[PDB]
Design a protein around this ligand. Sequence first.
Ligand SMILES: *[C@@H]1O[C@H](CO)[C@@H](O[C@@H]2O[C@H](CO)[C@@H](O[C@@H]3O[C@H](CO[C@H]4O[C@H](CO)[C@@H](O)[C@H](O)[C@@H]4O)[C@@H](O)[C@H](O[C@H]4O[C@H](CO)[C@@H](O)[C@H](O)[C@@H]4O)[C@@H]3O)[C@H](O)[C@H]2NC(C)=O)[C@H](O)[C@H]1NC(C)=O
Ligand SMILES: *[C@@H]1O[C@H](CO)[C@@H](O[C@@H]2O[C@H](CO)[C@@H](O[C@@H]3O[C@H](CO)[C@@H](O)[C@H](O[C@H]4O[C@H](CO)[C@@H](O)[C@H](O)[C@@H]4O)[C@@H]3O)[C@H](O)[C@H]2NC(C)=O)[C@H](O)[C@H]1NC(C)=O
Ligand SMILES: *[C@@H]1O[C@H](CO)[C@@H](O[C@@H]2O[C@H](CO)[C@@H](O[C@@H]3O[C@H](CO)[C@@H](O)[C@H](O)[C@@H]3O)[C@H](O)[C@H]2NC(C)=O)[C@H](O)[C@H]1NC(C)=O
Ligand SMILES: *[C@@H]1O[C@H](CO)[C@@H](O[C@@H]2O[C@H](CO)[C@@H](O)[C@H](O)[C@H]2NC(C)=O)[C@H](O)[C@H]1NC(C)=O
Ligand SMILES: *[C@@H]1O[C@H](CO)[C@@H](O)[C@H](O)[C@H]1NC(C)=O
Ligand SMILES: *[C@@H]1O[C@H](CO)[C@@H](O)[C@H](O)[C@H]1NC(C)=O
Ligand SMILES: *[C@@H]1O[C@H](CO)[C@@H](O)[C@H](O)[C@H]1NC(C)=O
Ligand SMILES: *[C@@H]1O[C@H](CO)[C@@H](O)[C@H](O)[C@H]1NC(C)=O
Ligand SMILES: *[C@@H]1O[C@H](CO)[C@@H](O)[C@H](O)[C@H]1NC(C)=O
Ligand SMILES: *[C@@H]1O[C@H](CO)[C@@H](O)[C@H](O)[C@H]1NC(C)=O
Ligand SMILES: *[C@@H]1O[C@H](CO)[C@@H](O)[C@H](O)[C@H]1NC(C)=O
Ligand SMILES: *[C@@H]1O[C@H](CO)[C@@H](O)[C@H](O)[C@H]1NC(C)=O
Lengths: 298, 242, 248, 49
Amino acid sequence: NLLLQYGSFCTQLKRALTGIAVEQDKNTQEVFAQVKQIYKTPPIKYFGGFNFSQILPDPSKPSKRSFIEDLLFNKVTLADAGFIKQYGDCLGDIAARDLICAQKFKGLTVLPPLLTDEMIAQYTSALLAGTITSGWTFGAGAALQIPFAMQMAYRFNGIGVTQNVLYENQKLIANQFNSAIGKIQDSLSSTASALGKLQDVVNHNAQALNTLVKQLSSKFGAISSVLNDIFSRLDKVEAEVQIDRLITGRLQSLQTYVTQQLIRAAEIRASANLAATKMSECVLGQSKRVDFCGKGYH
Amino acid sequence: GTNTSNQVAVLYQGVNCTEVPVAIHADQLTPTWRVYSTGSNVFQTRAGCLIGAEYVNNSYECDIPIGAGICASYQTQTKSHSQSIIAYTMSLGAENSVAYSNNSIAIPTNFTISVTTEILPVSMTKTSVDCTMYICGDSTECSNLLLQYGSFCTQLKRALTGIAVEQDKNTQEVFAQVKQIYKTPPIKYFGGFNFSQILPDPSKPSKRSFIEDLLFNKVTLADAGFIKQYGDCLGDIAARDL
Amino acid sequence: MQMAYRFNGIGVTQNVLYENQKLIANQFNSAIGKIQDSLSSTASALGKLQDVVNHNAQALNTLVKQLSSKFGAISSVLNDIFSRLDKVEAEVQIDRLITGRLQSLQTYVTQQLIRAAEIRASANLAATKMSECVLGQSKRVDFCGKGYHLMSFPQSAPHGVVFLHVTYVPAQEKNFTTAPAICHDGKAHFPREGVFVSNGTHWFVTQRNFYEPQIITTDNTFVSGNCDVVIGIVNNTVYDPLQPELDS
Amino acid sequence: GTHWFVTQRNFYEPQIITTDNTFVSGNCDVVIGIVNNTVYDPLQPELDS
Ligand SMILES: *[C@@H]1O[C@H](CO)[C@@H](O[C@@H]2O[C@H](CO)[C@@H](O[C@@H]3O[C@H](CO[C@H]4O[C@H](CO)[C@@H](O)[C@H](O)[C@@H]4O)[C@@H](O)[C@H](O[C@H]4O[C@H](CO)[C@@H](O)[C@H](O)[C@@H]4O)[C@@H]3O)[C@H](O)[C@H]2NC(C)=O)[C@H](O)[C@H]1NC(C)=O
Ligand SMILES: *[C@@H]1O[C@H](CO)[C@@H](O[C@@H]2O[C@H](CO)[C@@H](O[C@@H]3O[C@H](CO)[C@@H](O)[C@H](O[C@H]4O[C@H](CO)[C@@H](O)[C@H](O)[C@@H]4O)[C@@H]3O)[C@H](O)[C@H]2NC(C)=O)[C@H](O)[C@H]1NC(C)=O
Ligand SMILES: *[C@@H]1O[C@H](CO)[C@@H](O[C@@H]2O[C@H](CO)[C@@H](O[C@@H]3O[C@H](CO)[C@@H](O)[C@H](O)[C@@H]3O)[C@H](O)[C@H]2NC(C)=O)[C@H](O)[C@H]1NC(C)=O
Ligand SMILES: *[C@@H]1O[C@H](CO)[C@@H](O[C@@H]2O[C@H](CO)[C@@H](O)[C@H](O)[C@H]2NC(C)=O)[C@H](O)[C@H]1NC(C)=O
Ligand SMILES: *[C@@H]1O[C@H](CO)[C@@H](O)[C@H](O)[C@H]1NC(C)=O
Ligand SMILES: *[C@@H]1O[C@H](CO)[C@@H](O)[C@H](O)[C@H]1NC(C)=O
Ligand SMILES: *[C@@H]1O[C@H](CO)[C@@H](O)[C@H](O)[C@H]1NC(C)=O
Ligand SMILES: *[C@@H]1O[C@H](CO)[C@@H](O)[C@H](O)[C@H]1NC(C)=O
Ligand SMILES: *[C@@H]1O[C@H](CO)[C@@H](O)[C@H](O)[C@H]1NC(C)=O
Ligand SMILES: *[C@@H]1O[C@H](CO)[C@@H](O)[C@H](O)[C@H]1NC(C)=O
Ligand SMILES: *[C@@H]1O[C@H](CO)[C@@H](O)[C@H](O)[C@H]1NC(C)=O
Ligand SMILES: *[C@@H]1O[C@H](CO)[C@@H](O)[C@H](O)[C@H]1NC(C)=O
């Protein structure tokens, strides 16, 4: 009843966070959902001597992710952070704080994403199958099948090297590609700090919520941070002026959290637009821009 | 939409569907609330319990995004006729398989010309705030107290002025890329191509094209009162404009 | 001639335009008519600009409603605090109102700054699309429409710009048997600006984006050595155009 | 150091300098740093056969 005198602050904070939550799904739809049809790889995996077994999906896993995608998911130590269940377990006999149930008890929930990781893996599988079996032709319209050796001849003719270099050195190029994929596997199985960019995205969103939870113990100049103690120990003449400080401080902390989330959402949206550009121009085609996709001639 | 129907599904986030009448204290609630926890048409999504939507094994495009791959839609042809809210797992797209072979290629024998539309915002509305009139509103003692609070109003007006200059800079950067105003020859024949729908029309008072007229009619831009509004605001009218 | 240049930009020979000019003009006019029908029938496609209106009308209305809040004071009407209370108590009650209204106005300014940054990013993208696709022909994939880009036309719009991207999309596919090279007289022959294709028995060389079969000669093929190194090489005859001149 | 060839830029592959891979533009006076070498003609021994 005291909070109703303030009014439309809570509604616009809810609208801002709802806009951010819709924008995350929009970013994930923009980056991955670029292909119209879910292509699948042929059952025979002889692509001109090139070995794609470590990036193509693995049917042995329950979730159809590749080997390198499994390493990438294992290196990021993402916590629970909601996204599944997280109620009833808090009512259950864990008998611990758990750092997530306290936010759920305090009105701070975490919504799950619209696209699950199986569906993102199916998008990446479709993009990989289209790139392998059709080159850039599936980005401009219907997919046109082409052998991978002549696709590599197209890729060499793009960068200014005649295609006779490829057909005289095809086995050596295939061996170098397989060695580079093996070096990627050796790089991802030892250094867990390579994926620090995504770990910062996890850590900032955990840390801001922990700060917002821990800010409720502050008094903001009042006699107590406990809400019921001011009501019980004082009458209505000065309890309202003591709890107005608490309401002002908590509302200002909520506004600070929403402002920082808006700035971080703008930064994440810029990075997602860059990722969508790199998917459109380098996966679905060949890029002539210098240092846009890897050092050297792309 | 309430223009269509009043039927509503309810999502309890994170809650087990058996714990739904425990999570909300539905004994104390009205019987109109009790039909949205009764156990009749209840599904458990990864986000929690969804009550009032019928799960369908088909897959469609996402109409109303619930979450975790689950979407919902108001379907007309559900059951015998009986329009109702259905829930499903959203469909990624049509399934395809490229016929790869080591000596087979596919070459097009024809083409088509596609003209598509891309829409981009450029500038927004330039606003200005009188801080003394907003805070006090014709109160002299309030202004005398507000003078003690420092230079907040000056930096707020500075920020709004910077935004208002930036909008004009955005419009100048986007549209004024050419130094000379070229015009077409009076004979509008270009290789058999037709540009009569994008070239300017001198019949209109504002020399815009047909498609530009459609784009200006489609967006319901408010007049925003930057053209001589106060003569209207003086006159007492029954419909107070915003 | 301009559209022939735009076809040579995307890797199609220019005569493909000159033998099919009327069909391309008819397809362009039909697509322009379909754009007019799509804009006259559906209004939600302009929604990206409509929110630009709405966010500048929803916020200000919100800024009106914050004058109804008391912020812990006895009244939201400012003159009643002066006319009902003594001066010290009036200043105590009006400090809360001044602080609350100042905080609400600062919140509005911060939201306007963030929205202005987003609009500036969109305007920079629109200026890039005006520079690269209207004033030239872009080779970037999916930057200006799906397919191989030919032209773009700008149109103004309320608080924004609308690009009509004219692009080329291949339509009617056909299977062919192919080979990387043809080893004739012990010499491997590679195509210059085409691919080797076959229809059962005869081998031709085509451009990649359009089916135009041609007789494989020495003008459109080059020799890089013996056929042992190449994998998938086949045997055929490469015609010499200078050979009938050797008979005379 | 002995003979002159023409290659592609991004990979070493020497070829005999003929009229098929070179083009003619003007005289020898204006270009700075020009050298002397014999440009082979393939059609001349074929016509004399
Ligand atoms: C590459 O692709 C382009 C387009 O993608 C093709 O160009 C079209 O080709 C078709 C068929 O060759 C043409 O269609 C023909 O159009 C004639 C005139 O159509 C006008 O008039 C009729 C009424 O009479 C209208 O309904 C119509 O909308 C047009 O306004 C028709 O008279 C033809 O009909 C005859 O054939 C059909 C079967 O196709 C029979 O059913 C009929 O009874 C009749 O005998 C026919 O429909 C079309 O005009 C071409 N242009 C365009 C812009 O679409 C290229 O042919 C293609 N190239 C290759 C090599 O495949
Ligand atoms: C390039 O495209 C333009 C636009 O399609 C085309 O110009 C002509 O545009 C007008 C409208 O801008 C089209 O409409 C007709 O205009 C004539 C003018 O004499 C009228 O007589 C027509 O009226 C008939 O149809 C009405 C439909 O409601 C009836 O109510 C009426 O009684 C008449 O029956 C009609 O309004 C006109 O069709 C086009 N012209 C053509 C040939 O399509 C221009 O010609 C195109 N240029 C090229 C090179 O393709
Ligand atoms: C070019 O050649 C390829 C391979 O020869 C053709 O692809 C194959 O086309 C056939 C006939 O359409 C497909 O068979 C059908 O498949 C569908 C979907 O599974 C099935 O429902 C039908 O009952 C029928 O069996 C076949 O799947 C397809 N792919 C393969 C790998 O064989 C292609 O159509 C040819 N294209 C042209 C333009 O000639
Ligand atoms: C492609 O690479 C994978 C490994 O990246 C190869 O799989 C290995 O095959 C050897 C065969 O002697 C086994 O000993 C390994 O245990 C396999 N490793 C894994 C991870 O499965 C595969 O053989 C390669 N394919 C080709 C065609 O060379
Ligand atoms: C609650 O839901 C989870 C799935 O989200 C399920 O694993 C669990 O068994 C459910 N608990 C009960 C008591 O039904
Ligand atoms: C969907 O499929 C499952 C398993 O086949 C079945 O139990 C369920 O009744 C089906 N639901 C509908 C609406 O068909
Ligand atoms: C090409 O594919 C066919 C079909 O599987 C196979 O028999 C043949 O051995 C392949 N060619 C090479 C060089 O592997
Ligand atoms: C070009 O030729 C067409 C007829 O082919 C004629 O109508 C037109 O007036 C000529 N001039 C121009 C500038 O289009
Ligand atoms: C302001 O005065 C000008 C001068 O005649 C007039 O044209 C205009 O309509 C007036 N505006 C209003 C709102 O009365
Ligand atoms: C292949 O196409 C050429 C070009 O017209 C034709 O002369 C030849 O007969 C065709 N071969 C077969 C087997 O159809
Ligand atoms: C092509 O000709 C050579 C030389 O006669 C022969 O050795 C070879 O088997 C032939 N066939 C091929 C390369 O398919
Ligand atoms: C090339 O030959 C001409 C004519 O014999 C001579 O004048 C010139 O000096 C020569 N240049 C070089 C670099 O040998």
